Structure formats: structure tokens, C-alpha cells
Amino acid sequence: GVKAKVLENFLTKSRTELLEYFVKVIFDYNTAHNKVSLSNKYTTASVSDGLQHYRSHPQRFTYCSQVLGLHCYKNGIHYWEVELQKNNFCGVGICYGSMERQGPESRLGRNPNSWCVEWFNNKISAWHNNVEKTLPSTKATRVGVLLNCDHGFVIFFAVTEKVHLMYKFKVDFTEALYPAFWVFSAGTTLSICS
């Protein structure tokens, strides 16, 4: 019952307040799909023209152009921001480590093991468990993710002058979460903000 109270508090926090929970995210080399190149000390992920040299790995995505953060979060509260390149097809979210890495089930937001917001075909959508909800359009090119492991929720914010709520999900999480990302189409790039 007190989860609602904590959620309401976090929905009203300023960017400065959310940054008290800042975590440094870096992209995990062993998860990147071979169409995804990592650069800038593992803080930029881009769609590569040709295939990357990666060897197969049980954690590596082989169906969807995705990559995860290296660290997972099991307890406490965590906040990070991602800068998107204008007009790119891309997605920003969280997933359980037990999310599939092969097949259509590995796609972020299309299974019960992940939650995301996604820019695609000129729309912005929130996804979980293969259910999509179209969100109001915004010109924001930065997204903030507030993950609360203790009271069970994730909030997606559009970051411009201030933070603006995009969507939130309440969940009693059953295992640790990793930051999760999708990039698609030549030129698409996204970066973890400092």
C-alpha cells in the first residue's frame, strides 16, 4: 500500500533530486548483437554498417539489435540518462537477466521480462509483455530511467529543460534488472549521458 506513496513522491521529483540516485551505465560487450558497435569507452552504441567481429556468447543477442548494461540492480534505487540521435529508431528500457537472447521472445518489451519506451515509425510507445501503448509525441532527445527495486517500479522520463513523465510501470520484480537498449537502421546511435 505504501508503494503508491513512494511512487507518487518519485513522480514529483526534479532532475536534481533524481540524480541523487545516478548510476554509471556501460554497455556490455558480451551482450551486443553483431550489428551493434560499442565506442567511447563503452558509453556509445551504434548500428554498424557491416557485422562486428563478436564471438558467440550465451548472453549475446542474436535476433534483435540490442545490448544491455554491464551491471544489474537488485536492491535500492537507480537513475540513468540516455541521449538519442534525432529521428533514430531506438528503444530504452530494463530487463531481467533471464530474458531470452535468441528468437522473437528476446525483443525488448515483447515479453514479460522487460519494460521499455521505444521510438519507431514516428511514434513513441511504451511496451511490456507484448502490449504497446502509444505515448504523446515530444521532441525530447534524452530519456531518464528511474528504477526502484525496493518498492517495485520503473519510471521513464523525457529530459529537456526539466523531466517530464513519459510512462511508469508498477512491478514486484522477481530478479535483478539490467539497463536494456535497442538500436535500428544505419546511422542510429545512442549514448549514456555523464
Ligand SMILES: [Cl-]
Ligand atoms: Cl531488431
Ligand SMILES: [Cl-]
Ligand atoms: Cl544492487
Ligand SMILES: [Cl-]
Ligand atoms: Cl521514428
Ligand SMILES: [Cl-]
Ligand atoms: Cl524506495
Ligand SMILES: [Cl-]
Ligand atoms: Cl526537473
